[PDB]
């Protein structure tokens, strides 16, 4: 559905210095970080 307006959410994102063209509305899969010290 919509909950708070998606257009309004994207506008609020834009006005507060974030130039996010598309705010994700769904499943997001990021990459786990593996840090090695040699």
């Amino acid at each position: 559905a919509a909950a708070a307006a998606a257009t309004e959410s994207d506008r609020i994102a834009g006005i507060f210095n974030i130039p996010a063209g598309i705010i994700p509305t769904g499943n997001v899969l990021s990459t786990i970080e593996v840090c090695a010290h040699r």
Partner: protein
């Protein structure tokens, strides 16, 4: 490196607003090894010559 976010609830009443919380957990990698025994007789070397 894991970054974990925690959901919260918008609330009201005689309580000040609470801040959403990040948590950045790190675990160090634990290293181990295993080995096994394997012997070869001398005469085998003699025949490989």
């Amino acid at each position: 490196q894991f970054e974990v976010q925690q959901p919260m609830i918008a609330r009201d009443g005689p309580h000040p607003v609470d801040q959403p919380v990040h948590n950045y957990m790190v675990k160090r990698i634990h290293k181990r090894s295993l080995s096994a025994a394997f012997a070869i007789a001398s005469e085998a070397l003699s025949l490989l010559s």
